[PDB]
Amino acid sequence: MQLTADQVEKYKSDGYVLLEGAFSPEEVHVMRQALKKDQEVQGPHRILEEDGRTVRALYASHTRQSVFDQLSRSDRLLGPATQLLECDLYIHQFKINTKRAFGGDSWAWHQDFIVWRDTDGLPAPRAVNVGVFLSDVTEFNGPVVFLSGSHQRGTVERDPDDYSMTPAELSQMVEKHPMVSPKAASGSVMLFHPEIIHGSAPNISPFARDLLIITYNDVANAPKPAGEPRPEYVIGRDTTPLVSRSGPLHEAA
Amino acid sequence: MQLTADQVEKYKSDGYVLLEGAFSPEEVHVMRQALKKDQEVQGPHRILEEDGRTVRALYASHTRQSVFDQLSRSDRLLGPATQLLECDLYIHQFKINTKRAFGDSWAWHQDFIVWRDTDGLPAPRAVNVGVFLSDVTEFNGPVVFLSGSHQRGTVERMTPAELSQMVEKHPMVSPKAASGSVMLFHPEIIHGSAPNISPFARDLLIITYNDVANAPKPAGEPRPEYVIGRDTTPLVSRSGPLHEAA
């Protein structure tokens, strides 16, 4: 499973690329049932919404649900990831982000790499983020907004909650890096660069939007933290190369 | 300037219709210069943001800036409006709403019930005409309609649960188009405004045209004339481009 030449060049130039229809509706169903089951596990890997009534983020479902292990090693994701990075890979981070219905606007613009570098000791942006749409993503249910091409800016040379950017910063960025929101049916995949600027739009719809993000990292690019590292469910520690898996996802207890 | 057969049907079934490029870039420019001039006029018709820094809304700019008079009577707006209502028309309300950059809102509402029960508007024999003074994109806070929700009419004198039920039958749709575009929408349609997550303000002009025979009959103290029109004299339609005019 490979990106076309144009898809590679789109990833390189714009910082993201959308692969619609990567996983079938049957596969989406299997993953959604596994997500519902995993949301019942109580732990600090599960971030509840402010009102505590729903799950906002879930870390490391692939360690608890076999379907998500299957996904994480699927040819359809690791093929494109290996194509881009040309090395053995392991899972730096696995998370499922839920944007609740009627969720309101939050200032969430950020860049992944600078946090991983300065908080977690990630040396270099030799990684790729891979999103899997567990919901249809539309203009109304809180799509990810990229600043197109903004990964070309690199990252400044130089606790996690201290990082942020100002409206004035965002304004300057949009000048050369316009807002773009990939929209597609559940089962679609998008790959995006660790140094791209992104945020999610508010979900004004009555339905939650579930977005799975796997970050694959070069086994030679393992974090070298200076202090106590964050939990393994946030930042992977096992750099054993992933074994790729061929075939459909299937229900697995 | 007539709506096509499909555009009439669209308006009836879905409650809104978009006419892209109705006014040209040069006409948008003249309108935008008039907007900036009117935004400096102090008065109760000018609604500023809570920080007093910028203007959030302007009422009745057509009474102060000649190009907005020209706009308000353009045959490109009155042709469609007269075609839909088949009567003489006057201006019920003229408003410019500016959605500041980086500004949720939860603005789901229907105009007619407000005008009926606040102002004594008898019937929904009016049409709302939006004119895009800025581009309208998915990011700068477009109006979001619940398609077809005007078919519900209006109860005799909303919540998330109600909105969730509504969207099943009346899906969200947001007209998006370049500045100068026009959209007409039904007084009974449910609409809101998505948040503006962009760095630029979005300026949307709404003219409500009303049947001269449907003038408000308020039982209470009428709202001021710059909010709710009182002069029911039929509008004279104006042909031709907009032009700068002191």
Residues B6 and B196: their CA atoms lie apart, in Å, by 31
Phi-psi region of A131 (alpha: psi -120 to 50; beta: other; left: phi over 0): beta
Sign of the C-alpha dihedral computed for residues B208, B212, B214 and B216 taken in this order: positive
Q: Which of B55, B203, B100, B198 is nearest to A167 (CA)?
A: B198
Using CA atoms, how far residue B77 sits from A99, B4, B115, in Å, is 40, 14, 21
B202 to each of A175, B37, B90, how far by Cα in Å? 17, 17, 26
Beta partners for B19?
B182
**Selected residue of A140, A150, A172, A173 to mutate for chain B interface (largest B Cβ count, 10 A):** A140
Residue B123: which domain range?
Answer: 1-246
**The pair of three-digit structure tokens given for residue B182, joined into one six-digit string:** 């026009």
Query: β-pairing, B55-59 with B89-99?
Result: antiparallel
Please, is A71 exposed, middle or buried when counting C-beta atoms within 10 Å of its C-beta (0-12, 13-18, 19+)? buried
- Pick the closest to residue A1 from A94, A62, A89, A73 (CA basis): A73
What whole-number distance in Å separates Cα of residue B51 and Cα of residue B46?
14
Start-to-end CA distance of chain A, whole Å, equals 27
- Breaks in chain A (C–N > 2.5 Å) following residue: 158
CA-CA distance, B191 to B109, in Å (whole number)?
A: 6
User: CB A99: neighbour CB atoms within 10 A?
Assistant: 25
C-alpha to C-alpha distance for B120 and B199, rounded to whole angstroms: 39
Distance CA A155, CA A242 (A): 28
CA distance B218 to chain A (A): 35
Q: Which of B138, B174, B194 sits opposite A181 (nearest CB)?
A: B138
* Structural contact between residues A202 and B195, judged by C-beta atoms closer than 8 angstroms: yes
In one letter, which amino acid is A4? T
The 3-state secondary structure of chain B reads CCCCHHHHHHHHHHCEEEECCCCCHHHHHHHHHHHHHHCCCCCCCEEECCCCCCEEEEECHHHCCHHHHHHHHEHHHHHHHHHHHCCCEEEEEEEEEEECCCCCCCCCEEHHHHHHHHHCCCCCCEEEEEEECCCECCCECCEEEECCHHHHCCCCCCCHHHHHHHHHHCCEECCCECCCCEEEECCCCEEEECCECCCCCEEEEEEEEEEHHHCCCCCCCCCCCCCCCCCCCCCCCECCCCCCCC
Find out whether B207 and B77 touch, Cβ atoms under 8 Å: yes
The Cα B127–Cα B189 span in angstroms is 11
Cα–Cα distance for residue pair A132/A186, rounded to 1 Å = 8
B139–A171 CB contact, under 8 Å: no
Q: How many domains does chain A have?
A: 1
Query: Which of A107, A171, A202 is opposite residue B199, by nearest beta carbon?
Result: A171
Distance, CA of A147 to CA of A170 (rounded, Å): 9
Radius of gyration of chain A (CA): 17
Resolution in A: 1.8
The HSE-up count of residue A35 (CA atoms within 13 Å, CB side) is 26
Please name which of B89, B94, B92 lies closest in space to residue B234, comparing C-alpha atoms. B89
Alpha carbon separation from A168 to A148, B56, B194 (Å, rounded): 18, 21, 22
**Closest chain B residue by Cα to residue A207:** B164
Contact between B73 and B236 (Cβ < 8 Å)? yes
The response to whether A136 counts as a known ligand-binding position is no
Residues of A in contact with B144 (CB under 8 A): 140, 204
Token couple for B193: 């405004």
Experimental method: X-ray
What three-state secondary structure class fits A95? Answer: strand
| Phi–psi pair at B59, nearest 5 degrees | -100, 135
CB A196, CB A73: distance < 8 Å: no
Could B199 and A145 be called an inter-chain contact, meaning their C-beta atoms sit closer than 8 Å?
A: no
A&B contacts, CB < 8 Å: 52
Q: What is the DSSP string of A150-216?
A: GGGG------GGG----HHHHHHHHHHS-EE---B-TT-EEEE-TT-EEEE--B-SSS-EEEEEEEE
Nearest to B217 by CA among B232, B235, B207: B232
Tally the C-alpha atoms within 13 A of residue A170's C-alpha that lie toward its C-beta. 21
All residues of chain A having their beta carbon less than 8 Å from the beta carbon of residue B174 are 139-140
Contact across the interface for A140 and B199, Cβ inside 8 Å: no
Count the alpha carbons within 13 Å of A143 in the hemisphere toward its beta carbon.
22
- Helix B66-73 to helix B75-85 angle (10° resolution) is 40
Q: What is the Cα–Cα distance from A9 to B115, expressed in whole angstroms?
A: 55
- DSSP character at residue A82: H
